[PDB]
Ligand binder design. Sequence first.
Ligand code: F1S
Length: 834
Amino acid sequence: SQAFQRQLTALIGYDVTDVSNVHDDELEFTRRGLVTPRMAEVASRDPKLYAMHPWVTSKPLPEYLWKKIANNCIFIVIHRSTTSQTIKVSPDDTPGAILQSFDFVLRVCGRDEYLVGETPIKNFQWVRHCLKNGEEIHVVLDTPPDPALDEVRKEEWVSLWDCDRKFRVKIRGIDIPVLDLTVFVEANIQHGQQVLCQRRTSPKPFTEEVLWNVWLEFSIKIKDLPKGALLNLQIYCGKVQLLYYVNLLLIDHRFLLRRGEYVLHMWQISSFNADKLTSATNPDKENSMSISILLDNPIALPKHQAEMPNQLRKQLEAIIATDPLNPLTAEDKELLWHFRYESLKHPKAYPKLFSSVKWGQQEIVAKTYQLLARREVWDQSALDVGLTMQLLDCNFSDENVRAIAVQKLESLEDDDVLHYLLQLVQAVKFEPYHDSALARFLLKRGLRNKRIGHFLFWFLRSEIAQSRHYQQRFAVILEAYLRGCGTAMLHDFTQQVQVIEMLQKVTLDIKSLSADVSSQVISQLKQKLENLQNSQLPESFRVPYDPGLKAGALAIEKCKVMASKKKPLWLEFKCADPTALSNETIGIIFKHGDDLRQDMLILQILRIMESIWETESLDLCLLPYGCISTGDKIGMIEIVKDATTIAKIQQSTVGGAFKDEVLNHWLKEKSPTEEKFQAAVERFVYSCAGYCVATFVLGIGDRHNDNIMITETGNLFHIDFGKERVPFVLTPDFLFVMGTSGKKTSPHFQKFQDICVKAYLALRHHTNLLIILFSMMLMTGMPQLTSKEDIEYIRDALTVGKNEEDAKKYFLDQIEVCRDKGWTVQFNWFLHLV
Ligand SMILES: Cc1nc(N)nc(-c2cc(C3CCOCC3)cnc2Nc2cnc(Cl)c(NS(C)(=O)=O)c2)n1
């Protein structure tokens, strides 16, 4: 009867039904509320295309991928059983057209990946992958997968503007189980980041319980309170210092004003952090500080039923023209609002326009909704993700404003959703209420596409497993997905969850036995792994970072604990698919100890940078490997085949000291033919510039060379994204490959500069998008770096306000700063330990 709910809880990692940490029914209200959204998307989804989940794109084929096609022909090798043909086809041919040259369907050899539907083969991502990598398109004639397998289980389920009183709250007192300075309570009325009104209490001596019993009367009137308005209670001591915080929505999910007694358990500090805005309370009731308060005045918020001077218009357009991180003066705001209707014609003015609204004022908000009612330009405008994300950040608490951002997301094809999914999932932390347009948007795009749904699951589970601030919310959303994804997915998820759970235990036990690394622990590992092969590891499970790949039995011989501070497991799996015409294992690094969430964000931005470069016909051969945060301080990473670190190349031919020549003839040896050395050297030139530019922008380029890797075919790539300085790594050994020895300029070194610039200016063309991603990253992902100082790095990095020519100068100077420092920093890392 209810075994399903116990099944669901073990996949989510949290008990949705639990009510030990709440003071209203918003979570439960959101469960019931999310049912329609699910049911509708389940109802309407095409079952045949659902089971096969064809991953396709409407984007044009890039210039560099065309060049790898001769005479509008591509080869496709179909397999029968032991036999195989090799058809010729044109790019624009549909899989129907191709199949009718021989019901069946064309499945990719090795992977649960299908080539079906009315798109030209040039528009499948697998075909674009084969062409990019220079591999041939193998596929096995197969039966379509039964949609009966994807079945879903059968489911069962006084006006506010008429009160001229000033809002007030009573602070009864504060209490803390365990604790010579004094302390007070600060009360703020807030809308987004904006503080509409503020009041303090008189200081008292800080004992383990402190009672005040005061009313704090605020200047704001009850009618002027906007929907979303948080009451934010903070505790300072003292030269002041913040110790604890907590928030309470003054208008609930049913539009009623909040009333009565509350005992709220607070969050402790150790700055803009997403955690500071949460409606959640601390679930640790035994140790947390608690504040007690009283609200009393049932009141309900209603639901809404010339030419301009030459000079002033330019003043307006300069304001619209600035970056998202450029502040607005009171002068700027009054202008933007006065000329309201001129500003509405420009989609780009929107973030700044709605940051000019006085939200603590009933009539202004009313006027603002009349503005949103009259939006023809916005609804017509071409989708701009940069502008869309802006309206979903921490500055916008108004549901109606945020809703026009989601409206624009509706038009994104699936491929583009994948590109932004993680960030949109992190953007849910900025919503005031648990139920929201954004939550529903993610829910249904995941219910429509198995690939989206897969990564949606893992991104949610990641955040539920290591955030007490938002797990309650993310949990509710996950359940809502799992109840729609289909029995075949829930099966697949349950195997993935088990495998990682079995592997965690092994890691806990192993870690204890160490203090470098012995080989008795290597056998102890291989012992327990062999013991897991028959109890109770399933025959097959999907690779969470690459769900097409089913991985089966273990190659116990090749598995080993890594020579590293955290003792990660270096595992290797056989493939479960007989039809895979290869024999390379699946290599996974399983890591317990650290939080991989920051590693995801960075790698996901790397993929966004690629897609940007793609739109300007550029390819810089970045290598963003699979990396999934799977649980509390655990996760999996992809092993890149035929790869080694730049530092280990030094420990061979030198073994403190560094030599220039070494890298070049490491490549020379690993390349058989001369052409392949020359192929592999150019891949190094692209790689290096791409990774140089990309780290400079993100401000993570000054790295230690045991964290830079390279493939035998010359592809460079950074790893592990957890005095005097260098803007990025361009060490003399790299330069040696490029054919410059101190101070020269090779035909290769100049092309490196030629690309570096093209890359940089290309990124610059999407300044706003990158500025807003960076901002969100730091606020939702990295609780270390969150201030004006931190976030404003990228403004400088992308050289806002400068022109295309002067920026080029700026970057080429950064190339020379590196040149001028050689091995100095690299040595200094080594020196500083000693
Ligand atoms: C993505 C990838 N691919 C490959 N081939 N290798 C690695 C990798 C390898 C190695 C050693 C292997 C033995 O030689 C010394 C280095 C260490 N780390 C690697 N990648 C990695 C990336 N990101 C993180 Cl967060 C970590 N975690 S860590 C440094 O093991 O704690 C590892 N990572």
